[PDB]
Amino acid sequence: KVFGRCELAAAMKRHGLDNYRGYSLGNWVCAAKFESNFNTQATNRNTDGSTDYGILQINSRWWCNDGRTPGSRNLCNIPCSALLSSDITASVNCAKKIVSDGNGMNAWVAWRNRCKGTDVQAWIRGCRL
Ligand SMILES: [Cl-]
């Protein structure tokens, strides 16, 4: 599914991301926009042979099992395909683990480079939340 902006904000809010580890909801929506273009189905191979999955481009090196990243972990205890679902529950839950892991939302390169230090509240402007 390709979310609309506010639709994603609503979904991430209901699943508990707003202010999660101190990151306002606009940070999460912004991250999703530049990670996946709000597309739950997005996949992108990494140079090390891992792949990033779903609305928040969660990486099989650490966080999910895709069957083809040798020597990786699965800290979210999920198949990576769980992260491509139109229902974002798995993605959000996994994102909570990631952001709790010491590095905050720096774990998402698109967040660091396109959202961090910007007016991320813009990403939830207009939304009924
Ligand atoms: Cl915000």
Ligand SMILES: [Cl-]
């Ligand atoms: Cl959802």
Ligand SMILES: [Cl-]
């Ligand atoms: Cl932090």
Ligand code: NA
């Ligand atoms: Na893995």
